[PDB]
Amino acid sequence: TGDLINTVRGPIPVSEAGFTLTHEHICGSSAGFLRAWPEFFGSRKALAEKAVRGLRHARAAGVQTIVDVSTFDIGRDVRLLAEVSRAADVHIVAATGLWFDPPLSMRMRSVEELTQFFLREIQHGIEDTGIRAGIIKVATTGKATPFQELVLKAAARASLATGVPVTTHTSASQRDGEQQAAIFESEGLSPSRVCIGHSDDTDDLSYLTGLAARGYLVGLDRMPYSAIGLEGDASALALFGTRSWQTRALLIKALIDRGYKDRILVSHDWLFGFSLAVTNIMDVMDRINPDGMAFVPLRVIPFLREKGVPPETLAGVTVANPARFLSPT
Amino acid sequence: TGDLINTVRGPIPVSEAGFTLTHEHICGSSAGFLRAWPEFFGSRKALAEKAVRGLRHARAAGVQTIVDVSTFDIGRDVRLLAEVSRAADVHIVAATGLWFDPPLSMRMRSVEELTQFFLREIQHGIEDTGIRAGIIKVATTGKATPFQELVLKAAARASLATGVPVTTHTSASQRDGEQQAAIFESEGLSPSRVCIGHSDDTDDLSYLTGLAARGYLVGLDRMPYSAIGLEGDASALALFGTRSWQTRALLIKALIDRGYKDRILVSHDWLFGFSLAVTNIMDVMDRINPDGMAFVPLRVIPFLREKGVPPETLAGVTVANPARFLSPT
Ligand SMILES: CCOP(O)(=S)OCC
Ligand SMILES: CCOP(O)(=S)OCC
Ligand SMILES: [Fe+2]
Ligand SMILES: [Fe+2]
């Protein structure tokens, strides 16, 4: 009681977040793209209706909150989010930060300037909205570019000032979390404020447990992503991998087994629109996982339960861990 | 009489364009940047006031029209343009196309899809505005990337369908215009519909005359850009060059001398806001050329006149050539 998190619809008690998906997207896009070329998505109205149907479905499966980790460079549209949230009756936490597609106007900025930009989105609001970010997203793909280091640092500085957490994109098989951790630690950020994302993209428990031992949250956030039985499509193969959802799901159990149940964050990394990819890739995705953001409660939790993970443990993972992570600290 | 060009304020007779700067910017930015972080520019209001003061000044010097060649990826804000145009009483033609900073949502698109995007901006309007583009901007920096080839082709296809002209960014010293020309010609575009930009960045008349002989318009569009007496600042040196404005201006005379007066387009490539660059670079620019978009009528035309270029020739360059270029053909 009495700790608050900013949502697209305004503030809520942390205790009201409930079953929370911590790495999600309404639309995966680019800044200004949705405004410029709505027809790409059929229409803006079509995209919203699809997101509402999707989020209604998640909600029926027990999801009460999602964190949309779309940054300015993922084409985050806070008005869209608010609209869909209201319609679906699902809370959405918005993000600041930057992903690996920053435009030059961002790439030319100093660490100080980036810090002011993240803070503005957190403390003041996004664009002219008044809608405040509840999280900061950052990214690497392998070893950090020099700009990427500035971003990670600005992210840490913003976090220290606000108590808002940081979440990351990684190339998991390259073990990016180790560098990201060092940089965050250099800025003095507590690891408990940090989630190392896409960690389910690897089965290297040495890497994962090492992070969890330091106190980092480990994001097992691409649960539905598999290219199996779609070995034809090269684009899909790179995007989705050859590991099954079950293989990915087992990692949650593996961590719990190693004593790290408190350090786990679980998600889909789903979206309802996808311009960042070739045009077919939305539909291919919907064929593979028609349950969308319902997948984790429908398929993952029962699988874990059948494997012996206790229901209270499952609750701690899906409710307590997000609540603790989100709570400005 | 009776040929029309689309402006941000609506259609105008071609004959009303008058003294026209064909390669300009209100703001050089990135998609959504101005919406997200207006404080970068002091405020949106500050940026507009500066643009109005600048364009008032140009107007007093005789400029009646400018073509803002800012694309979606240069952070073109058509509402801003309309506002400033109205206030300054200077016509602004808006652009479609893409520059060399396209986001992934664009980079993932097919040639067909790009063609539909350019056409939408031309035939329907930009964003939800109803404001139609009067020109298509495209770019290379050296030899074309494969995506850049698709863009050039989509640009040609849109042009053929509309009669709207194409203008380019080049790495002039690498002679990009020759490749760009070949691609446009492959798509069947007339060279008279095309301007090969930043051609004043080189003194290679062999390259320039070769283009002019084929019927291309040659854009001598960075007239005020010189780093001389600023040999300290490395950033400026790359951006502005070591050639004087006079050296750049002489090229106009050189072309006229070679019989190509009808093939010349003249400009500044100025802007009033600049996020695409490091933070100081706006102010450095304003110190060098306080006249802004007035520079060409103030300094360039008189220099040419003093060198013997006839006033009627100067008129043909600054009025007739733009009119002919802009007129949907
Ligand atoms: C395939 C989904 O990948 P991301 O989390 S990097 O974001 C793109 C929206
Ligand atoms: C220095 C001005 O360069 P550009 O024409 S490439 O556009 C940036 C606005
Ligand atoms: Fe994501
Ligand atoms: Fe330009």
Say how many CA atoms lie within 13 Å of A119 toward its Cβ: 15
Residue B69, strand partner residues: none
Burial group, residue A229, by CB count within 10 angstroms (0-12, 13-18, 19+): exposed
Return the bridge partners of B140, or none: none
How many residues are listed for chain B in this entry?
329
Q: Convert B215-279 into a string of H (helix), E (strand) and C (coil).
A: CCEEEECCCCCCCCCCCCCHHHHHHHCCCCHHHHHHHHHHHHHCCCHHHEEECCCCCCEECCCCC
The DSSP code for B293 is: G
**Separation CA B211–CA B216 (nearest Å):** 6
CB A48 within 8 A of CB A83: yes
**Length of chain A (residues):** 329
- SS3 category, B69: coil
Residue A205 belongs to domain with CATH number: 3.20.20.140
CA angle A179, A184, A187 (to 5 degrees): 130
Residues less than 5 Å from ion ligand 3, measured at CB: A 269
For A238-246, the CB contacts below 8 A with 24+ separation are A239/A277, A239/A281, A240/A288, A241/A201, A243/A203, A245/A295, A245/A299, A245/A300, A246/A303
What was the structure determination method?
Answer: X-ray
* Cross-chain residue pair B277–A108, CB shorter than 8 Å: yes
Measured CA to CA, the distance from residue A4 to residue A7 in angstroms comes to 9
Query: CB-based contacts of A132: which residues, under 8 Å, 6+ apart?
Result: A6, A94, A121, A122, A123, A124, A125, A126
Alpha helix stretches (DSSP H) within A139-233: 146-162, 176-186, 205-213
> Which range of residues forms the domain containing residue B49?
1-329
Nearest to A32 among B31, B108, B116 (CB): B31
Tell me the CA distances in angstroms from A156 to A103, A134, A152, A181, B209, one per residue in order.
21, 14, 6, 11, 55
DSSP B211: H
Structure-block tokens of residue B8:
């941000």
Rounded CA separation A59/A54 (Å): 9
Both tokens of A266, joined, read 């679980």
For residues B222 and B293, the answer to whether their CB atoms sit within 8 Å is: no
Identify the residue whose C-alpha is closest to ligand 1 atom 2. A269
- B33/A103 Cβ within 8 A: yes
Six-digit token string for A294: 């319902």
For B:67-106, CB contacts with A below 8 A are 72-73, 75, 101, 103-106
Amino acid symbol at A246: Q
Please tell me the distance from the alpha carbon of residue A185 to that of residue A182, in angstroms, as a whole number: 5
- Give how many domains chain B has, as a whole number: 1
Q: Which residues of B are annotated as a binding site?
A: 23, 25, 137, 169, 198, 269
Whose CA is closest to A63, among A13, A17, A9, A125?
Answer: A17
Task: Spell out a b/e string for B166-181, using b for 16 or more CB atoms within 10 Å of the CB, else e.
Answer: bbbbbbbebbbbebbb
Q: Are the beta carbons of A109 and A145 closer than 8 angstroms?
A: no
Q: Are strands A91-93 and A95-97 parallel, antiparallel or unpaired?
A: unpaired
Contact B30 A127 (CB under 8 A): no
- Mutate one of A41, A44, A105, A121 to test the B interface: name it (highest B CB count within 10 A): A105
A37 touches chain B (CB under 8 A): yes
Give the relative orientation of helices B146-162 and B111-119 as an angle to the nearest 10 degrees.
40
Contact in structure between B57 and B110 (CB atoms under 8 Å): no
Reference A297, options A272, A266, A321; nearest CA is A266
Could you give the strand order of the β-sheet that contains A194-196, starting from the edge strand earlier in sequence? Answer: A95-97, A135-139, A166-169, A194-196, A217-220, A264-266
Burial A47-80 (b: 16+ CB within 10 A, else e): bbebbbebbbbbbebebbbbbbbbbbbbbbbbeb
